[PDB]
Amino acid sequence: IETVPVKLKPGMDGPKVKQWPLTEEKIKALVEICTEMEKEGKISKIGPENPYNTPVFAIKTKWRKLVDFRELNKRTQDFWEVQLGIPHPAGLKKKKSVTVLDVGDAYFSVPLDEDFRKYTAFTIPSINNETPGIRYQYNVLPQGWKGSPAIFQSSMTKILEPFKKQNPDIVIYQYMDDLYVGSDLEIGQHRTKIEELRQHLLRWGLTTPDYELHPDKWTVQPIVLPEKDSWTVNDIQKLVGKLNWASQIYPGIKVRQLSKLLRGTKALTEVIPLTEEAELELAENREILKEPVHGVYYDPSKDLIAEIQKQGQGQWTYQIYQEPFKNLKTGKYARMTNDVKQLTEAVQKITTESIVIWGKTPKFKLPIQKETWETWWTEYWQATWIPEWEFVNTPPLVKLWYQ
Amino acid sequence: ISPIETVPVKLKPGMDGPKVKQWPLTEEKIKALVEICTEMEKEGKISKIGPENPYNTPVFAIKKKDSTKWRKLVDFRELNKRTQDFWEVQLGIPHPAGLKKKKSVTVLDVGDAYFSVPLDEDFRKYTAFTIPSINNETPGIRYQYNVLPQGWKGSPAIFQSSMTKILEPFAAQNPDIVIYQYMDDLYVGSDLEIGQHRTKIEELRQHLLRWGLTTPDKKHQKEPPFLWMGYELHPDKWTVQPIVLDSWTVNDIQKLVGKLNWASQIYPGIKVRQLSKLLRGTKALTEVIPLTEEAELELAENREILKEPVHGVYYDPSKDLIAEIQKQGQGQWTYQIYQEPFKNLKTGKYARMRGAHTNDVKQLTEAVQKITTESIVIWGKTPKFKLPIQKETWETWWTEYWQATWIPEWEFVNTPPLVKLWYQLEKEPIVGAETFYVDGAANRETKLGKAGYVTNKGRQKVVPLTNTTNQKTELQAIYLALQDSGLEVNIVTDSQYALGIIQAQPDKSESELVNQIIEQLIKKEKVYLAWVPAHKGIGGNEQVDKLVSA
Numbered sequence: 001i002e003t004v005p006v007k008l009k010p011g012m013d014g015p016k017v018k019q020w021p022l023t024e025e026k027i028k029a030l031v032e033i034c035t036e037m038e039k040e041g042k043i044s045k046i047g048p049e050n051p052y053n054t055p056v057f058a059i060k061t062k063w064r065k066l067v068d069f070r071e072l073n074k075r076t077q078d079f080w081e082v083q084l085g086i087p088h089p090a091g092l093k094k095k096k097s098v099t100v101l102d103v104g105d106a107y108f109s110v111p112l113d114e115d116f117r118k119y120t121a122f123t124i125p126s127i128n129n130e131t132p133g134i135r136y137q138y139n140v141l142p143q144g145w146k147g148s149p150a151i152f153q154s155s156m157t158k159i160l161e162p163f164k165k166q167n168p169d170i171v172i173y174q175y176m177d178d179l180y181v182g183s184d185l186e187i188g189q190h191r192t193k194i195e196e197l198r199q200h201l202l203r204w205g206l207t208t209p210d211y212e213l214h215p216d217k218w219t220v221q222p223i224v225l226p227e228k229d230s231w232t233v234n235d236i237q238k239l240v241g242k243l244n245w246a247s248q249i250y251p252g253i254k255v256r257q258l259s260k261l262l263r264g265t266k267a268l269t270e271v272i273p274l275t276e277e278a279e280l281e282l283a284e285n286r287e288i289l290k291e292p293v294h295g296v297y298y299d300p301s302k303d304l305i306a307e308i309q310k311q312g313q314g315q316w317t318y319q320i321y322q323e324p325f326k327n328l329k330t331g332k333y334a335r336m337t338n339d340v341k342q343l344t345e346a347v348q349k350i351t352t353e354s355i356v357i358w359g360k361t362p363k364f365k366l367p368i369q370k371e372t373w374e375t376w377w378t379e380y381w382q383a384t385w386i387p388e389w390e391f392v393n394t395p396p397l398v399k400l401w402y403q
Numbered sequence: 404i405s406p407i408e409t410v411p412v413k414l415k416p417g418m419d420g421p422k423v424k425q426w427p428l429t430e431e432k433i434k435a436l437v438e439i440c441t442e443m444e445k446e447g448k449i450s451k452i453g454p455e456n457p458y459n460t461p462v463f464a465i466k467k468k469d470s471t472k473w474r475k476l477v478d479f480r481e482l483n484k485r486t487q488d489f490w491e492v493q494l495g496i497p498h499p500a501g502l503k504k505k506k507s508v509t510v511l512d513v514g515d516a517y518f519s520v521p522l523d524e525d526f527r528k529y530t531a532f533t534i535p536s537i538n539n540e541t542p543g544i545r546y547q548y549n550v551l552p553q554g555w556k557g558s559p560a561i562f563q564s565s566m567t568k569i570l571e572p573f574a575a576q577n578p579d580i581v582i583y584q585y586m587d588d589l590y591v592g593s594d595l596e597i598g599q600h601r602t603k604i605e606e607l608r609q610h611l612l613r614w615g616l617t618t619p620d621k622k623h624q625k626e627p628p629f630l631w632m633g634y635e636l637h638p639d640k641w642t643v644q645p646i647v648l649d650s651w652t653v654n655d656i657q658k659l660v661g662k663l664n665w666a667s668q669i670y671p672g673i674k675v676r677q678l679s680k681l682l683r684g685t686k687a688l689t690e691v692i693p694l695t696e697e698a699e700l701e702l703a704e705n706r707e708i709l710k711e712p713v714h715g716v717y718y719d720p721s722k723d724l725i726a727e728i729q730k731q732g733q734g735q736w737t738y739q740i741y742q743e744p745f746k747n748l749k750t751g752k753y754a755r756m757r758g759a760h761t762n763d764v765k766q767l768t769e770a771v772q773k774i775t776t777e778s779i780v781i782w783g784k785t786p787k788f789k790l791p792i793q794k795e796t797w798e799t800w801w802t803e804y805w806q807a808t809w810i811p812e813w814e815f816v817n818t819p820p821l822v823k824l825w826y827q828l829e830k831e832p833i834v835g836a837e838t839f840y841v842d843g844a845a846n847r848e849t850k851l852g853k854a855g856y857v858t859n860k861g862r863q864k865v866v867p868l869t870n871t872t873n874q875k876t877e878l879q880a881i882y883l884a885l886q887d888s889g890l891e892v893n894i895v896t897d898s899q900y901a902l903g904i905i906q907a908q909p910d911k912s913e914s915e916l917v918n919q920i921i922e923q924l925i926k927k928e929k930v931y932l933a934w935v936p937a938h939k940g941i942g943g944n945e946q947v948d949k950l951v952s953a
């Protein structure tokens with residue numbers, strides 16, 4: 001088959017990234033996987049004249065390879081995002097159910113431009129440096145790579161055309177390695193269609209590993225001020241603080257009346273009666289806070305940002321946004337667990353949501369020390385993709401005031 | 404010399420070969436450079452060339468020690484600066500503690516390693532050199548390499564890569580043997596009978612030779628003194644090679660610290676806190692330095708530890724790794740890793756990473772982090788921990804801590820000093836407790852300002868301050884309200900800065916002011932601190948801000 005030529009963005013060199021060290025169970029898993037892959041010509045071992053490197057992991061009963069093509073993608077996908085891009089349906093966010101299929105296997109049937117392949121180099125590392133790492137590079141379309149779905153996009157339309165005609169009301173979107181299938185039918189009916197699709201795909205050669213999302217049920221986390229019968233001076237001071245903050249997210253907030261209550265030098269525990277003006281000023285602000293924030297648009301040109309705060313009791317709040325106070329979405333996960341297992345489950349929940357809504361992953365700011373996260377994220381992780389992340393290590397002293 | 408395939412090599416994208424002038428040389432050396440090259444020419448290592456090649460790099464001759472035999476040294480600096488980048492040879496050396504105990508172990512060095520491996524034909528032209536002419540009259544004689552030049556950027560990596568190829572089949576045919584690779588050396592170990600081990604070692608020699616790589620036979624090194632990369636490797640144990648050291652320059656200091664750090668692999672509780680403080684400014688290696696009684700006592704303790712010889716074991720997969728951490732002084736920690744109850748695999752220290760307002764639990768968690776990672780590199784799994792902190796103390800900390808944190812399987816070890824939380828702020832305002840409204844402020848020109856408070860029972864105070872920053876005053880105010888307080892106080896600031904410091908429950912800081920706050924916060928019975936926005940018409944705040952801003 002012919003190879004679609006691929007050129008990095010110009011004035012850019014291929015990825016050169018340190019391979020984090022692995023446990024011996026993952027390494028064994030990886031040499032098993034990559035050995036099979038090589039017999040099947042997917043990859044092949046490589047010289048030392050190839051200096052490039054992209055990291056590799058093992059995530060899971062059987063093991064799965066995972067490659068971090070985040071640098072390569074930042075150096076290639078951006079060109080293919082223009083030249084060879086993939087449109088995102090505004091309707092998928094509205095479907096009742098969205099199932100997510102893995103169609104990574106598809107990519108192993110298109111070959112990659114021989115001139116590109118050196119840039120897909122990875123290194124299965126070795127314990128205690130007993131040996132040089134095993135080095136390979138890809139000859140077919142790699143699973144992590146934002147190029148791979150883009151090139152296969154043509155072939156992928158030809159396979160789904162029959163189904164998309166017998167079923168014109170189901171939405172299908174392709175985000176690197178995964179197929180988002182949204183329908184508006186009973187879970188049981190939707191569950192079949194998907195099974196009917198899986199069979200379609202297999203008829204035409206796409207294996208699909210043998211969950212269910214409900215986006216219409218999705219809703220933001222509104223700002224909620226306390227609703228108490230008697231207010232201590234502290235109770236009022238805090239309420240003043242929270243509003244004073246909301247003023248950024250929400251024009252129309254007022255604290256004159258309520259701050260009047262705090263006229264003097266009182267003790268924190270003293271109970272204060274609420275003046276009618278404040279009870280109204282308070283009553284007006286509550287309505288505004290209930291009002292869905294209005295006037296924030298998604299600007300494709302810009303990166304999304306996701307912040308996550310750890311509340312207690314297994315709960316985590318988040319906000320996604322492009323500019324500081326102009327929030328595209330906010331949410332709260334409560335868990336049914338290691339903090340870190342919780343935090344990776346969040347990151348994955350948020351990324352999925354963000355793929356479905358905007359066809360974009362955000363860049364997380366994770367409240368966890370870097371090395372702890374680098375040491376343990378792959379332990380809980382089940383996604384085929386990996387978002388960008390930085391680490392906040394300065395406490396969000398801001399009172400949670402996010403519920 | 405090897406039928407091994409060659410690695411395609413290329414010069415940098417927009418660069419071309421070297422063209423350096425060859426300098427004149429004592430005629431005695433010219434004769435030697437001729438004999439050496441003639442022999443190399445006879446072995447195919449080098450081939451003579453004509454004026455068509457326009458590239459040159461310089462050659463030289465060193466006495467070859469006391470041998471008085473001379474040796475050839477080409478200087479490949481330019482060529483290397485123009486030779487493409489490679490996949491680098493691993494920098495990490497294996498740590499002897501991660502070496503699985505094996506009955507028999509053989510060390511096989513490879514003779515003229517590089518010269519035994521071909522060079523990409525199309526690259527040879529650039530590896531060209533000129534033997535200087537005897538008299539300035541006669542053009543010199545010219546050559547290029549057909550094998551990996553010794554000074555070249557690429558010889559190591561290409562040598563490594565070709566050896567890996569030559570081992571893959573053998574190493575597959577014989578899973579019973581474990582072959583390791585480091586530079587020119589191949590360390591093979593086995594659990595077979597001495598005879599079966601030797602038979603396979605010979606079979607290996609046999610194999611390597613068919614690929615043009617020679618190895619010793621019964622001139623292999625003897626085990627007892629495997630002096631390797633700084634270690635003594637005995638068949639039953641490993642240690643560090645003996646470490647010497649009274650001198651008081653700067654460079655003498657760094658060498659000493661480095662030697663001590665190297666000894667910390669295995670020698671428990673070598674200390675370098677003080678001595679590393681004497682590395683302030685530095686730069687002048689010759690600069691002399693005053694030996695503090697705190698650092699020169701340190702060195703006294705160290706010599707005593709270096710009088711006792713310490714050994715470590717090799718590693719046993721069957722058994723668990725254990726790691727146990729002791730708090731040593733302030734911001735200093737120490738740790739052993741072991742499988743049996745007094746037979747250490749290795750030890751080490753961890754010291755408080757740069758940063759103000761630290762805390763012992765946070766540091767402990769950090770140290771578990773460095774040990775966990777270390778473990779994965781050496782052994783490929785994480786250890787079970789033995790830590791001196793109750794699970795009451797940890798579970799409290801992590802549940803309230805703003806970040807995610809995690810520590811794997813661990814067990815309390817009642818060995819003082821125990822890691823504890825020196826205080827805990829109240830979650831809720833205290834009834835019947837004076838409510839101190841504090842503020843501070845300072846003038847960015849005059850480096851002056853005021854600290855103060857105002858209370859509900861009418862109490863007030865202001866003190867003047869000199870050479871202070873606004874933060875330092877925000878924080879000083881807190882200190883006052885504490886000093887002039889009971890056992891139970893409520894404090895109200897507008898300082899996000901000050902709030903943050905205290906809420907993070909620092910256990911110490913370099914900021915004496917913080918330490919005073921901390922030592923006050925201990926003596927207190929209960930403290931609740933609370934935050935209000937500034938200049939927003941809040942009560943005590945407005946009053947306190949007037950008191951000390953004007």
Ligand SMILES: CCC(=O)n1c(=O)n(CCOc2cc(Cl)ccc2Oc2cc(Cl)cc(C#N)c2)c2ccccc21
Binds near residue numbers: 508592637638
């Ligand atoms: C009864 C045990 C015994 O005789 N010895 C033993 O167990 N060790 C530990 C190292 O064991 C090795 C195991 C394997 Cl699979 C491979 C090589 C090993 O040795 C190396 C490793 C390295 Cl990176 C450098 C060198 C040098 N120079 C040797 C021993 C080490 C030395 C001598 C004997 C043993």
